[PDB]
Design an enzyme around this catalytic site. Sequence first.
Site, PDB file in Angstrom:
ATOM      1  N   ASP A 143     -47.082 -17.365 -78.049  1.00 44.51           N
ATOM      2  CA  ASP A 143     -47.696 -17.233 -79.392  1.00 44.51           C
ATOM      3  C   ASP A 143     -49.234 -17.897 -79.162  1.00 44.51           C
ATOM      4  O   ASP A 143     -48.818 -18.627 -77.964  1.00 44.51           O
ATOM      5  CB  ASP A 143     -47.097 -18.143 -80.079  1.00 44.51           C
ATOM      6  CG  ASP A 143     -45.686 -18.082 -80.541  1.00 44.51           C
ATOM      7  OD1 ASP A 143     -44.611 -17.847 -79.345  1.00 44.51           O
ATOM      8  OD2 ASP A 143     -45.589 -16.841 -81.790  1.00 44.51           O
ATOM      9  N   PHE A 180     -53.609 -17.766 -73.467  1.00 41.80           N
ATOM     10  CA  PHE A 180     -54.044 -18.842 -72.621  1.00 41.80           C
ATOM     11  C   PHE A 180     -55.124 -18.700 -72.120  1.00 41.80           C
ATOM     12  O   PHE A 180     -56.077 -20.503 -72.001  1.00 41.80           O
ATOM     13  CB  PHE A 180     -53.441 -18.692 -70.747  1.00 41.80           C
ATOM     14  CG  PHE A 180     -51.884 -18.509 -71.174  1.00 41.80           C
ATOM     15  CD1 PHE A 180     -50.674 -20.006 -71.653  1.00 41.80           C
ATOM     16  CD2 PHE A 180     -50.946 -17.164 -70.822  1.00 41.80           C
ATOM     17  CE1 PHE A 180     -49.883 -19.584 -71.540  1.00 41.80           C
ATOM     18  CE2 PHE A 180     -50.134 -17.063 -71.170  1.00 41.80           C
ATOM     19  CZ  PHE A 180     -48.874 -18.043 -71.686  1.00 41.80           C
ATOM     20  N   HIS A 200     -42.132 -20.875 -68.894  1.00 40.01           N
ATOM     21  CA  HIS A 200     -44.275 -21.167 -69.566  1.00 40.01           C
ATOM     22  C   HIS A 200     -45.063 -21.975 -68.872  1.00 40.01           C
ATOM     23  O   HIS A 200     -44.307 -23.587 -68.136  1.00 40.01           O
ATOM     24  CB  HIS A 200     -43.144 -22.270 -70.916  1.00 40.01           C
ATOM     25  CG  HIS A 200     -44.243 -20.915 -71.474  1.00 40.01           C
ATOM     26  ND1 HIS A 200     -45.650 -22.284 -71.690  1.00 40.01           N
ATOM     27  CD2 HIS A 200     -45.453 -20.161 -72.553  1.00 40.01           C
ATOM     28  CE1 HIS A 200     -46.638 -21.365 -72.502  1.00 40.01           C
ATOM     29  NE2 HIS A 200     -46.410 -20.175 -72.706  1.00 40.01           N
ATOM     30  N   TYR A 228     -52.616 -20.244 -79.079  1.00 36.42           N
ATOM     31  CA  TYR A 228     -53.068 -21.467 -79.244  1.00 36.42           C
ATOM     32  C   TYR A 228     -53.192 -21.438 -80.373  1.00 36.42           C
ATOM     33  O   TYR A 228     -53.819 -21.330 -81.139  1.00 36.42           O
ATOM     34  CB  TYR A 228     -54.043 -22.058 -78.354  1.00 36.42           C
ATOM     35  CG  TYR A 228     -54.618 -22.507 -76.431  1.00 36.42           C
ATOM     36  CD1 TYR A 228     -53.168 -22.545 -76.152  1.00 36.42           C
ATOM     37  CD2 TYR A 228     -54.931 -20.875 -76.188  1.00 36.42           C
ATOM     38  CE1 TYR A 228     -53.309 -22.157 -74.393  1.00 36.42           C
ATOM     39  CE2 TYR A 228     -55.601 -20.965 -74.540  1.00 36.42           C
ATOM     40  CZ  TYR A 228     -54.262 -22.173 -74.088  1.00 36.42           C
ATOM     41  OH  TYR A 228     -54.213 -22.048 -72.652  1.00 36.42           O
TER      42      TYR A 228
HETATM   43  O1  LIG Z   1     -51.900 -17.828 -75.577  1.00 34.27           O
HETATM   44  C1  LIG Z   1     -50.899 -18.604 -75.494  1.00 34.27           C
HETATM   45  N1  LIG Z   1     -51.747 -19.857 -75.458  1.00 34.27           N
HETATM   46  C2  LIG Z   1     -51.320 -20.520 -75.586  1.00 34.27           C
HETATM   47  C3  LIG Z   1     -49.091 -20.515 -75.183  1.00 34.27           C
HETATM   48 CL1  LIG Z   1     -48.947 -21.890 -74.991  1.00 34.27          CL
HETATM   49  C4  LIG Z   1     -49.095 -19.173 -75.164  1.00 34.27           C
HETATM   50  O2  LIG Z   1     -47.732 -19.035 -74.765  1.00 34.27           O
HETATM   51  N2  LIG Z   1     -49.797 -18.091 -75.195  1.00 34.27           N
HETATM   52 CL   LIG Z   2     -50.960 -25.701 -74.140  1.00 41.08          CL
END
Ligand SMILES: O=c1[nH]cc(Cl)c(=O)[nH]1
Ligand SMILES: [Cl-]
Length: 224
Positions: free
Chosen positions: A65, A78, A188, A67
């Site tokens: 998901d 990310f 993760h 941030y």
């Molecule tokens: O874009 C993202 N940001 C942070 C997380 Cl933890 C992730 O799974 N995906």
């Molecule tokens: Cl994070």
Amino acid sequence: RPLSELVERGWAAALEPVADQVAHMGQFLRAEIAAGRRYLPAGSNVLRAFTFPFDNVRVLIVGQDPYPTPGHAVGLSFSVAPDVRPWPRSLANIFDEYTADLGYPLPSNGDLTPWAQRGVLLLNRVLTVRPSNPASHRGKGWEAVTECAIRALAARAAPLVAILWGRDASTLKPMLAAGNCVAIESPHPSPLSASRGFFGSRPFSRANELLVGMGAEPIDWRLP
Ligand SMILES: O=c1[nH]cc(Cl)c(=O)[nH]1
Ligand SMILES: [Cl-]
């Protein structure tokens, strides 16, 4: 309303089967704002992974998901804006494995745009979140949309390596069971899970060896 207004044409064609579902997401998000429940990333960034060409994807990264902290999520899993410091915890961890794996210098900033420009699709299983509430849009209808995206990628003729980071790996691998596809998983990169198999996983050079085994060109991972 037409997906062609929001994403690259190849993606618009690939996601036509869930175009109604995407329209219902827009309505949900609109209601969230009317209710004082913001969401992240910004509206114009929600489908940003799908603004780079569908036909050029060679590596699919799937996270969980976006941030949850305001000022982080930008619609590429990310990634953060290039002025953002500190980096979020998952990205710092990603960047340490990057240096350990490829031997390149630590990146200057947290902008993963260059990867996206080189055919790495930076996807999350769920494309929005409520601020300060991790994973809060799970079950709200994005999973149908990201399943369609993954399955369309897998159905292309071309070689694909999927890098599956976190708890969705087991749900996603069956979507990527097809001949031109290899799916590789790890826990993760968030710090509570990263210690359990993300670190030392070598996904960047692994992905490139696999691409070369399929007769495809390896990704230039180098960030400035
Ligand atoms: O874009 C993202 N940001 C942070 C997380 Cl933890 C992730 O799974 N995906
Ligand atoms: Cl994070």
